[PDB]
Amino acid sequence: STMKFCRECNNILYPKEDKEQKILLYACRNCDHQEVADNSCVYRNEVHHSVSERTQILTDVASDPTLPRTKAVRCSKCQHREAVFFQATARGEEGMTLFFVCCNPNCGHRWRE
């Protein structure tokens, strides 16, 4: 996806490989001009998943899933059974630890497993 124009006729260069040369070269089909390639990179693309242009708003693609909610646990500060549970790592601990977030709009309490 790297396009460059040769200095002679200002036309697009096509990458090619020569077994004898054992080096990357660029030569356009308009003039018999060959230049030494740089950085040895013929394709560089940042991976993106935005293949559905102008369609992700009307149709719910669910790119960011909602966290699950459970009613078995009971909050400490308030007697509310609804909470949000998820797995995340601690500041320096190793592994995944279950976390809880209270769903009461007036409580705002979070605790670990």
Next chain:
Amino acid sequence: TNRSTVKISNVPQTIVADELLRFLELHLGEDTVFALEIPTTRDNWKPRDFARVQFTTLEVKSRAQLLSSQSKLLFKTHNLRLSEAYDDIIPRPVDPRKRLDDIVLTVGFPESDEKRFCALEKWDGVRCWILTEKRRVEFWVWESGDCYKIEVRFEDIIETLSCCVNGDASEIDAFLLKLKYGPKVFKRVTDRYRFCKEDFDFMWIRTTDFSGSKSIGTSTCFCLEVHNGSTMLDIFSGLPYYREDTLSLTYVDGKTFASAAQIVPLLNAAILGLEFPYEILFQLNALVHAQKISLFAASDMELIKILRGMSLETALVILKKLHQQSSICYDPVFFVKTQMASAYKRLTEQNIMSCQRAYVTPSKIYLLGPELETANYVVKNFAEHVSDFMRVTFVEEDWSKLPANALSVNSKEGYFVKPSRTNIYNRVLSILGEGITVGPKRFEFLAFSASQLRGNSVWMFASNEKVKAEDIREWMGCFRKIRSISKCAARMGQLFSASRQTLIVRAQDVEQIPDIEVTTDGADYCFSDGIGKISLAFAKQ
């Protein structure tokens, strides 16, 4: 009749604090209401069905109660019912005489044997409230904008004395407050249903000393500069153990005794500049910490010159004799003028060791001294540096357990509640990190036992050229294998229980035998947790 705060039973939900305040001031006297607060279930828009009102004077409260009993209070077709409240909105004394404004506050200690008082730091325009019901006295000090609250309980003050500053024996312009324990220190931090009549919309969090020179930490007495106050004697007569005698003091220039270090009440080492022994210096410092001999009375050149050249045993005997008396000694030099191997065998026979015990408080530090107690396993192989071991515990000013509110007070910031560490938390961390420097020694953290964790106590060992704290720590074992903070500390402090010595067992007489484990219903149940086997010959040995 104890307090002036009254709880109103039923009020209309549509009203605001201003309307109720206007109604009360119309029915009662003008501006006779101090604090009016209506609790809200929500943040600022859902008030409750009741309210609490604090009156300025008890007579207004009695009149309001009489009006309520006669059903003469009708505010928006609602009959207000008045009842007693559990607590006051603002801890403010009812008596206007107790409230003292714009008075000079100074701290110090009885530096000289005679009636001489040394002033460390003087604060002007402080506020003093005497709360008889709460059995405490509040001092509000404004320093660099933010104000601080100093609370002195009745138990803290051991005796009350009255003095004069103008120089007239008949006049009484000062009051000495001999404090045994340190005072609590607070700090101020930064409306539709709260009138409050003033700017009391803040909170108090416990903090360390705010003085630059740490005058409060090194001062065991408080002096209240006041006017003639002929009628003030009756108010000051309520303080416990009041002396009905007239005494005069003399101000002494004692601004030299100012330490910027965290550990305030310790003596300066550069003043000595000699080869003074560590044990005698520690005993003298512990005596100074106790309410026996003042700092300036023990910092004189004559006393240290006398104590420098003398037999060690007689010096220790006279020091413990001076410490044993309950009465305060003003001139220890006159007292000491008028007055005039085994550790290893004790360890082997009953494990008797003299362990130094230290108490760390937010205001100051208390040294108990070489108290005899039982011995652990570490001192068995480290019986040379007995004085290097020091037991350090963290308590409050009254030597009680630190409350949870004094460390990491909760606060709601943002969406969730995030705790905010107090200055006492940082002070404890700094003490654990830097360590305690007593005389020609510096104590570092070794470990804490399982029992000491509950008691908020820890062991500290002074590093020496032959052996350091890290040397002992690595001699005990390698704890890097443990990846759990609690588990590693528990294992490191596990080998500190008292035990009796016996013969040494080599590493070649060992064996590995399989254990038993059964898993039923998806539960791991192990029978062999700490069981073992022993022979009869080994048991006899």
Next chain:
Amino acid sequence: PPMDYAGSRPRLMDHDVTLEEIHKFFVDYMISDTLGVISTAHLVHADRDPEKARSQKCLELANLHSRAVDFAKTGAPAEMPYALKPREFPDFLERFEKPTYISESVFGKLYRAVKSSLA
């Protein structure tokens, strides 16, 4: 049947101890330390309601007590709820400042008997 003895998941760090996290753990043990109040609350609640040690409140108190007694080994706070505090004390307590209520359980009978014997 007895309660389950399954403890909390251990917390393993990705690096060695730098001698500061142990200090942080020691200082943080002073806060969120409800070992002594859980037993008193459980005793008061058992004294108050009938069929003691059978309701879910007593089971929750026992679970909290187990989690608090496991705090010394595993760094898991007990998280004592505010609504579970007793707020009332029987006659056989030294908290004279706190409100004292008359107890009619076996402990109250023992206290009445010992008071009558000493008087």
Next chain:
Amino acid sequence: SSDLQSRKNLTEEISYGLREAEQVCNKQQLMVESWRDFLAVNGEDKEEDSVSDLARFCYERQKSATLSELAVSAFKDAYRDVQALAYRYGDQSNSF
């Protein structure tokens, strides 16, 4: 309302209730997998950035359907209390 003062109090109360409901909806919108690092009990320095962007929450809610449904549910739950104020500020003789 009985008088003008009651009407003013009701208006202020409604405004504060609507503000509280909006804040509740903003808090509820965070219950997604993208904020699991912020919702955990740790040390995050981006606490102020979550509350500084007030106008971005509306744009995010309008673009996402799941976020819109969550915000609607939270708004109804918070607005039940606001609707409850009519009984406090309403007379018994009111025809409605």
